[PDB]
Symmetry: C3
Subunit: 260 residues, 3 copies
Amino acid sequence: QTKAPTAEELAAAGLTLTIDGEVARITLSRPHRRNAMTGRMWTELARIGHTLPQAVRIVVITGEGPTFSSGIDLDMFQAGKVDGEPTPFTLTAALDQVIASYQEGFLWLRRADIVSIAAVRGHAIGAGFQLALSCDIRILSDTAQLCMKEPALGLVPDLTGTQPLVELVGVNRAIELCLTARTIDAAEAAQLRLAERVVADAELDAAVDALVAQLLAVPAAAARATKELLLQAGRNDLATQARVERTAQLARLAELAKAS
Amino acid sequence: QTKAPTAEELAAAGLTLTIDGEVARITLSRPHRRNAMTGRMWTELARIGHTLPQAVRIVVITGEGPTFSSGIDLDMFQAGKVDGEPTPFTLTAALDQVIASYQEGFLWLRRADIVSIAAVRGHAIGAGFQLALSCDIRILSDTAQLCMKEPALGLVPDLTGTQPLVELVGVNRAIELCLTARTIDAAEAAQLRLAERVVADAELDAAVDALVAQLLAVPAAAARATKELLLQAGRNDLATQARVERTAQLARLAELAKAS
Amino acid sequence: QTKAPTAEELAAAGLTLTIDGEVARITLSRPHRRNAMTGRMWTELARIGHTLPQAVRIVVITGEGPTFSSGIDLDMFQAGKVDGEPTPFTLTAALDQVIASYQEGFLWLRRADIVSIAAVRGHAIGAGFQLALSCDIRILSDTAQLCMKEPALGLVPDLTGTQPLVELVGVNRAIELCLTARTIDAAEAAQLRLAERVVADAELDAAVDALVAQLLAVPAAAARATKELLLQAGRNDLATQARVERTAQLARLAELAKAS
């Protein structure tokens, strides 16, 4: 709330944030720990989302080094403090609130006024896979490997990953992936629609930059209104969706006419 | 209402309609304008749907010439009359009603008692893509190119395209396609499930005729009842869908027994 | 209710059931009749599901011989008794109840505490295809052929197949498959996501055993909780699904802590 987290605050939580005009880049920045995630990292992610400047309309998430994220830092299942905050294992209404605070680090990636992109190389495991899933678009390196590992550890996926997983691959494949907890390669991810594009590792940065340029070339207000429409389409009946579309078009035509 | 539009009325709106027994063929018929669509064309499409004879159970939509449709005629964004009716730009409750009248040209393609097929060659852009999306089945030529262009023009898709797009390719890919407004080729369309079949251009008419023959070989009442069931499946819980299926089967068994 | 059906009772209904520890194997066992299904078979399937021991968490369904199932036994459309019970043709509230009893043979395959696998070779037609569809996972032999034949016979699919079909292939493809009643091969099934894996016929048993081993290696309670979450994901809004996930995680953390 109020002020954005500082670069120093973010560095202590394992993140870097750079903003250039309409594009924000968030980098997981603990390569020696394979970008293992902590509670503090998730709650700072939430803080970044709540305080981004209004002009930002694209958010790119990637990892420093060859691994996107190994998932949750195993110290989070020990008694003490991790990154200065108490672990779940320490702590049920209070645990419920902490988990809800962590989920807020992922939920904002669906906001209609941003397009979020995960640029994934190497392993995205567990919480790492759920971070990539929470983004609108995934661009994978040919090195990428994805795994919903939580059930293998006796846990469920609780960082908002279940819904996008089922939307991408269907409930049946989702069951297979989660209940085997198996690791899939980038070719398989592409086949299952988990990646919107797979490119050679050397080309991942250029592929993300090409997609950013394509998005910036579409006007901001139409992009936002259209994303808002698409997120409602699945759950609406057709008659309702047609009304919602029509309502949105009136606002576009209004803005365009006042503009000229 | 009451009488079907005449061939002369349809020709002035850029359409041809031929009916042979149980099959109706609607052709966009302005090849020199790349079958660009107008308000009058949409409201005549709605009139065709409301007055088709009861025996028609299949509807095939294609374009005259090498382009299915370039989308909305740019004159629709000018002050005057297009095809004899006032433009949106001329005109908000009244604009809401006009848009709703245009949507009715697309909505009826989902009726349970028809199977609608879009046979697409060359470009289907914007309103043209939404027409193809509104059909049950798309058969593409290898020449086909699809593009949701509206956001690039500062507009949203409001001709009922959002829901089938999300059902076909998933919300994530839908965001990518709409917010980049990019053009996809037929091979990509096939990969994304946007086309049920892609064939050589010379073979498009034969492919449509083969599919028509397959549909006609299934009895009309079972086809209708089954389409009605499938359209309800996504939004129902499993227990409810099983009840709906069972209810439909009682009616089939009834009709079959009275038949014999 | 109460006691499980005996092996003798099951054999008279065309089924075999073997249980080994956490894995139950149900085999359609009328190869000379291409495992054609009857009312008695469906209601025994329901009885198996209602009485399986608590320790069973995986259920494998396959056919004896080269055909999974030719679908409904044509005698079910004749006047008399089939397998000792009266046919639908004999018999509307009473017919409604009989059909609902048959559906219960398929519905239990979605229970959260089991993973159900259909191992399909040769033809799975009509009721046979709906049995395979009702399972969480399908592994196909390269010999497999699938067909939703009901509409061709003047019927609808009423054994709970419509919803999984639409979830797998999308409503549009579902319409095409059901309203043409056409037969698809295993390569096509794989392309359409109807099969989670296709393997050489000689390798089908090993492929199923590999998947079973993968499932058994994930703890039972996390598997169950995760399947329960995934089945709710499609119909929930994102905020609701995040709450459901969080609720499930509290129970996991509880059980794990009491465990240690």
